[PDB]
Amino acid sequence: MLESKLINHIATQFLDGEKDGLDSQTPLFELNIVDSAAIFDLVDFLRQESKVSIGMQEIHPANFATVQSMVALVQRLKAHPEQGGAALE
User: Fold this and answer.
1) φ/ψ of residue 54, rounded to 5
2) Radius of gyration of the chain (CA)
3) 21, 35, 76, 78: which has the highest count of C-beta atoms within 10 A?
4) Domain range enclosing 57
5) Residue 86 contacts residue 56 (beta carbons within 8 Å)
6) Are 74 and 50 within 8 A, CB to CB?
7) 8 Å CB contact between 65 and 28
8) DSSP string spanning 16-61?
9) Are 57 and 40 in contact (CB under 8 A)?
10) How many structural domains comprise the chain?
């Protein structure tokens, strides 16, 4: 249900608080519903819950194409200690 919590978050600012075309298993790319702008928000949600950091370099919608894409993107960096902080404080 955590996967629908990241949806309804931006579904407010994007869809007037309605869920249609935008959900976890729904193809965010094929329907083009979510912008790359809201990816930055979906990031904060995932990295916060999973207690990890991700770099802006890795923050792009290609990796957040669906729930199964974005979940697995976090799962790869989970095995890393520290990453993303390149030329950044």
Assistant:
1) -130, 150
2) 13
3) 21
4) 1-89
5) no
6) yes
7) yes
8) TT--SS-SSSS-TTTTT-S-HHHHHHHHHHHHHHTT----TTT-ST
9) no
10) 1
Two structure tokens written together for 23: 């959900």
The structure tokens listed for 15 are 């869809």
CA gap 14, 18 in Å, rounded: 9
Q: From CA 36, how far away is CA 59, in angstroms rounded?
A: 9
Start-to-end CA span in the chain (Å): 33
CA atoms within 13 A on the CB side of 46: 26
Query: Is residue 7 a contact partner of residue 22, using CB atoms and an 8 Å limit?
Result: yes
To 10 degrees, the CA torsion angle through 13, 4, 28, 69?
130
Nearest to 6 by CA among 33, 24, 31: 24
